[PDB]
Amino acid sequence: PTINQLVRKGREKVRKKSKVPALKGAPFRRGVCTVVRTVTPKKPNSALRKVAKVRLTSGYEVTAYIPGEGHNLQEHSVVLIRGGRVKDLPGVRYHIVRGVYDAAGVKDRKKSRSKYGTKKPKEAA
Amino acid sequence: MLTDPIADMLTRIRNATRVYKESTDVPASRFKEEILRILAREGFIKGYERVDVDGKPYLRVYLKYGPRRQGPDPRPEQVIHHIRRISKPGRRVYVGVKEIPRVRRGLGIAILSTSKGVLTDREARKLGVGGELICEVW
RNA sequence: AUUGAAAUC
RNA sequence: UAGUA
RNA sequence: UGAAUACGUUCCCGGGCCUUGUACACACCGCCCGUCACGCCAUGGGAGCGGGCUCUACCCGAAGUCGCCGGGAGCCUACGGGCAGGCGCCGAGGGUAGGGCCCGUGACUGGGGCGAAGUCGUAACAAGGUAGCUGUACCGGAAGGUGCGGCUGGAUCUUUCU
RNA sequence: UGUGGACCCGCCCCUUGGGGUGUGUCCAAAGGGCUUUGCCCGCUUCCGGAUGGGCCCGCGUCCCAUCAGCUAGUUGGUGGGGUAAUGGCCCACCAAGGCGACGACGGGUAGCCGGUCUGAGAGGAUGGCCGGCCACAGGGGCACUGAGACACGGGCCCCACUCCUACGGGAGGCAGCAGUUAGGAAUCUUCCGCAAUGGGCGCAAGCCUGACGGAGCGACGCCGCUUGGAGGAAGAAGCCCUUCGGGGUGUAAACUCCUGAACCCGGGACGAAACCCCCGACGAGGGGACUGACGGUACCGGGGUAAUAGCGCCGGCCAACUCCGUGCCAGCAGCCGCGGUAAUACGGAGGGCGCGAGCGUUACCCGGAUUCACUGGGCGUAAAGGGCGUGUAGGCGGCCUGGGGCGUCCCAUGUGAAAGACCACGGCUCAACCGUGGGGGAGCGUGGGAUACGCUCAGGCUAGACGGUGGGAGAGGGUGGUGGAAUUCCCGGAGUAGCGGUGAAAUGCGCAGAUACCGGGAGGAACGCCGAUGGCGAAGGCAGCCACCUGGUCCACCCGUGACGCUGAGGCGCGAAAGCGUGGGGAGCAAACCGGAUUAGAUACCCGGGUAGUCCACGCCCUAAACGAUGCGCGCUAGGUCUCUGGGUCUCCUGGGGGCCGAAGCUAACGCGUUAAGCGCGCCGCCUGGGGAGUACGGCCGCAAGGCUGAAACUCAAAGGAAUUGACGGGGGCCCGCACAAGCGGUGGAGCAUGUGGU
Ligand SMILES: [Mg+2]
Ligand SMILES: [Mg+2]
Ligand SMILES: [Mg+2]
Ligand SMILES: [Mg+2]
Ligand SMILES: [Mg+2]
Ligand SMILES: [Mg+2]
Ligand SMILES: [Mg+2]
Ligand SMILES: [Mg+2]
Ligand SMILES: [Mg+2]
Ligand SMILES: [Mg+2]
Ligand SMILES: [Mg+2]
Coiled-coil segments, which residues (chain B)? Predict the structure, then answer.
């Protein structure tokens, strides 16, 4: 645009928006579970993928994802949420954190033990 | 109407030089004459001279080129590679001696109009003045 | 059973 | 009919 | 032992060269659009019901500063005056009537996005089998079809699906 | 009592209420202690200094125009009050004013700065801690006291809330330090000391200080350091691979000597010399004593134990691969994407890579992102040129001279606090931390200077623009009039059995005589040939012929004016078709509709009819593939060829328009290429991934239909442009094969043989 135009109108700043209302920025948020359905994904995939709907301390009610092998969660379970999309599951924008509250660690987990939330074992250790 | 005479000139020279012409008329002004001396003095052109064309003042301009050249495409290199307005009617550019540009680590001009008169960058720097930064040639 | 399936016996 | 070059 | 027939290349099937147009490249057994149905998500309209901000008019108005009185009506007085007290203006805020406005809930209701293999067709991409698109206007389960005018962003000198 | 100072008035200087001055009036005070006649702590009036602050002004300070008009103390005046003091700060009276596209008013959001982070920079984001200014002290008013307050731990009233209450009434305010609770992913000790620095009162001794100086808890951040050092096999065991020979973990352990984190003993700080007392004189200077929370800590010496390692990752981007397990399951995934019985991508193993008292994860910021492009972008076909004009404000502006010195440049000087950043040199054993010193800087005030460029003022020019005169082509527009070919209807003649229509048909029309033919008449719409690759118009658009009324444009002469120019937000006007209102008109054609067909169906394509409409008057609507998908203007940059309209000295030359080809250059390409998409200046308008969506809300316009302006949630890793090689086409051209046609003999029917399906 002409300078005069730039002097009249300016450039407009680019403001992209949050990919995750866990509201107040908050790196995590507290949930109480509501439903613990099982979800089929999309695209070129198939498997029965574990999910929860969660009432938030934000006032939000949202679908989050239970990662790991097996779980211990049901209608009143009470979870922490960290946010983290799934990708195969449209509308699933958050993750349940394994190892806080009534969400269990992950039994017999040896490799990525820090995620999945599972204390160090005592076999030959 | 002809919004920028200086630019017209700067361009007439750009255009003529690119079809390897020998000469170029430009309608004549005093400020136009000035820029041409600096151009001539730094050996980007051979020079200029007044004329009259149809009752009316023009400045003929003698361009200058390299030697004819080797392989496929024997067109000369060009003595004026780059000539370019900077201050412009729609946006005037003024600089003080402290902020005068060094065109092409030395190998380049920046014609530059000051209260001491029209001047190259090193001239102006040494005289210690700044001004409306007219253009740049390299 | 048929191709890994969905459908189908 | 879906995944697959 | 021993025939018949071939004009010809318009048609059907397979194929070779040039050129064309393509939204195909799993390469036409290709792609692909809309209704209806199933699930998930967010969303528009919305009578009433609820809560907040707010402007205009009238009225009530704490505290307090300021103004008036301050009397044969109280207290102090050196008689000048002072104090108590009373009247008023303004004034936090409140009340009534009227508007404009935000939030919540919202029966009822509109379309929308997304979701491996549901339903009816076949609109579009090849001249897509009635070129296509288009503004508008009627019409129709659907995609659409017609009318009028426009544009080339069109090729040519027996019937649907995978 | 009046050094003095206050106020009225006058005079002088100065220049807003600053000094000075003369009469007149008015205004001071406090005492206390002694080492007691000579000191000390105080008191009163004045002028000054220092420090702190109040009010005024210029400039700078986020988002929405889907907020466009706002304002009655409102703008100004005179005179009052009020204050330390200006001022509608407040009040009476007069006047009719003030503000706003340079964004008033309204809505949202936010304490601001030094600086912090990021970035090559420009810039973006941010304002915790430390330092500066502001505001607030449960919410809302108000004043009192005072040098200062409209006062967090002062006062009053109203509201909410908690507690005491003999129900009348009271009390209260951690956004001080700790600490409790609640919300929350999350944020500490109800710690020691006034020893140091600072603050308040006191003559002092001292008393007070959750300011502060320390300790405690958090790997929350930064820095330092430990978990050993040197020997130690052609190499133990175990565990992983294995083409069964071997390869790996691996000098790694074992074990040999060595050092000696931890821990025990001994000693043990600096931080603190003042105030105070003594000499001197209550001074200067000298002397002296008291005082350590941290702490029995730091540091020194002596002794002395081999004494912690975890987390993430190994498909690509990105450093690191093999075996088992598992089979679109279980699961992974930042993005592309891994998993369907051989998975370096899932889970375990061994091994490997990277960091290491940490390592990962989530959130937020700058980055990469020249992806809001000032530096530093774009719009023919990718997102993007307004449908066209007219012109308002605004932006921009030819040649020469002169004045001014606002823009702009230069020199001095002031300001730019400290902390931070930067360069040095120090101090804690290093560093982190800390200290001392140095070096910079835009921006702004002030004085002086330059005048090329931009501004402005004065005068000049004629190359831009406009006018004059003479000449030209044109479906440019408006009004009236008029002409012939065709269709439809009506009258007449003649004349007979069908016509029409399709792929084939049927509906239809016809013996009340149609079709085809000749004559006559009525009426509406559109104008054949000329006709073009043409012409005119700003667009939409404009086509028989005549006349009147009227617009634009080109050329020649070089006559006149003298920059009178370009663009143009908003405004106004024009704006095809369809549509709407009133009133006409109505021949042909034709949405809708009524029928005939075709089809698996056929709300369609084909056929027969047919209303609105198409036409005219007046008034609306205002959209389009309103297309050159290319805004307007000007200057510059090879040519060739065809063509419309001028002019000349008429092979050709010089204009103005219309086409194609193509130098240079441009472009992702295809293309554009003096009719630019080239090289350049000026102005406008527009874009910023796709879907949701030109939808919603809002405003404006419209009689309506609807038009203009125009989002978000949510979702996808694409959506796109041009070209490429193929494949394809109910596309084209050309070819061939027992491919079809031309033939001859057969299978399909029977019985049986054989193979297959199925049972
Ligand atoms: Mg699949
Ligand atoms: Mg398919
Ligand atoms: Mg993993
Ligand atoms: Mg950037
Ligand atoms: Mg246009
Ligand atoms: Mg204009
Ligand atoms: Mg050192
Ligand atoms: Mg019409
Ligand atoms: Mg009408
Ligand atoms: Mg018909
Ligand atoms: Mg529309």
Answer: none
